[PDB]
Write a protein that binds this DNA or RNA. Structure first.
Length: 242
DNA sequence: TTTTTTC
């Protein structure tokens, strides 16, 4: 792992990650916008469906999640599969692997249909069971990138809908992808998957909350709105990993 | 433009 990184991430803490999530994270902003233009249950269903097709994008993540939010705001959505069948081929930022992606939506449509208000609250109180349930519906490994971040974005949606905050489970790990490998190789020769899981365990900050911290800081987003005590912590983290 | 997944 990294004692240097884990100590500063521990100082930032779940509440520092939460500040970034609710103030800087553009995915959270797009979700908060969408939640104002569609009913709560459809909102959460769409966010999970979107997460499951958000890979190998023809654009950057922030652009795509705003495109998704702007597309469904005020839209009358019945079948989520049918909605995506029309949305994806006309989108700007998600035009690759549409046949594969539509088939994943079709296969998870029955699980999404169980997401009443009460079911969404139950899963938000036990995101590990939601993690396993989504993977089982798809027939994939729950540690796969899309399933892990379907849980993260569900957590964004659920905290908006329910006006409560439950931290992500510690046992949901960041999987390896292109940008986590590119960054981690500069920091260490350790295996990226093991590196970041040990950092989460040592710091006390679940991996999905660490993810919220890393990318805005690396991408150069302003941290000036953070309170000075948290700002100085994020500043030191930047000097360590950027 | 190059920004995970398959059955």
């Amino acid at each position: 792992g990294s004692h240097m990184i884990a100590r500063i991430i521990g100082e930032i803490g779940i509440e520092g990650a939460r500040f970034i999530e609710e103030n800087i994270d553009e995915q959270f902003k797009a979700l908060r916008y969408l939640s104002k233009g569609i009913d709560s249950e459809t909102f959460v269903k769409l966010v999970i469906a979107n997460s499951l097709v958000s890979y190998q994008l023809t654009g950057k993540g922030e652009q795509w999640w705003w495109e998704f939010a702007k597309y469904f705001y005020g839209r009358d959505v019945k079948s989520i599969y049918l909605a995506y069948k029309e949305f994806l081929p006309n989108s700007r930022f998600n035009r690759r692997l549409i046949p594969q992606k539509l088939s994943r939506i079709r296969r998870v449509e029955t699980f999404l249909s169980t997401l009443t208000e009460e079911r969404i609250e139950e899963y938000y109180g036990d995101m590990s069971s939601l993690w396993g349930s989504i993977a089982r519906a798809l027939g994939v490994d729950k540690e796969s990138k899309t399933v892990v971040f379907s849980v993260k974005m569900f957590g964004y949606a659920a905290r908006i809908v329910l006006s409560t905050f439950n931290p992500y489970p510690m046992e949901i790990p960041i999987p390896e992808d292109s940008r986590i490998v590119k960054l981690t190789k500069k920091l260490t020769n350790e295996k990226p998957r093991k590196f970041w899981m040990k950092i989460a365990r040592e710091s006390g900050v679940p991996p999905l909350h660490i993810d919220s911290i890393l990318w805005p800081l690396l991408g150069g987003a302003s941290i000036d709105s953070a309170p000075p005590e948290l700002r100085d912590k994020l500043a030191e983290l930047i000097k360590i990993i950027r």
